Amino acid sequence: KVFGRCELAAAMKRHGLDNYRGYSLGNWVCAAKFESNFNTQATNRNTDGSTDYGILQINSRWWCNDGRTPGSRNLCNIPCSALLSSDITASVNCAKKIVSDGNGMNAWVAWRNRCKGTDVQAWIRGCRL
Ligand SMILES: [Cl-]
Ligand SMILES: [Cl-]
Ligand code: NA
């Protein structure tokens, strides 16, 4: 599913991501834009052999099982395919675990490089939320 901006903001809010761990909703929308272009089906393989999945590009080395990432773990207890669904529930629940792992949203390098410190409130401007 390719979400619209306000559509994704609304879905993230209904799943409790708005201000989760102190990260306002625009942070999450910004991260999703740069991670996946708002596309739930996005996948990207990394040099280490892991793959990032879904709207928030969650990685198979730690967070989900894809069967082809040696030595990796599955801390969200899900197949990585679950992260590609139209329904963002699984990605949100897993992102809550990731952002709670110690480094906040710096766990998403694209958030650190492209969203952190910027006017992230712009990502939700105009939305009926
Ligand atoms: Cl915001
Ligand atoms: Cl934090
Ligand atoms: Na894994």
Curated annotation (Swiss-Prot):
Lysozymes have primarily a bacteriolytic function; those in tissues and body fluids are associated with the monocyte-macrophage system and enhance the activity of immunoagents. Has bacteriolytic activity against M.luteus. It comes from Gallus gallus. It is found in: Secreted. The active site is at E35, D52. GO terms for biological process: cell wall macromolecule catabolic process; defense response to bacterium; defense response to Gram-negative bacterium; defense response to Gram-positive bacterium; killing of cells of another organism. This is Lysozyme C. The gene is LYZ. Pfam families: Lys. Keywords: Allergen, Antimicrobial, Bacteriolytic enzyme, Disulfide bond, Glycosidase, Hydrolase, Secreted, Signal. In the egg white and polymorphonuclear leukocytes. GO terms for molecular function: beta-N-acetylglucosaminidase activity; identical protein binding; lysozyme activity. InterPro entries: Glyco_hydro_22, Glyco_hydro_22_CS, Glyco_hydro_22_lys, Lysozyme-like_dom_sf. Disulfide bonds join C6-C127, C30-C115, C64-C80, C76-C94. Lysozyme C is capable of both hydrolysis and transglycosylation; it also shows a slight esterase activity. It acts rapidly on both peptide-substituted and unsubstituted peptidoglycan, and slowly on chitin oligosaccharides.
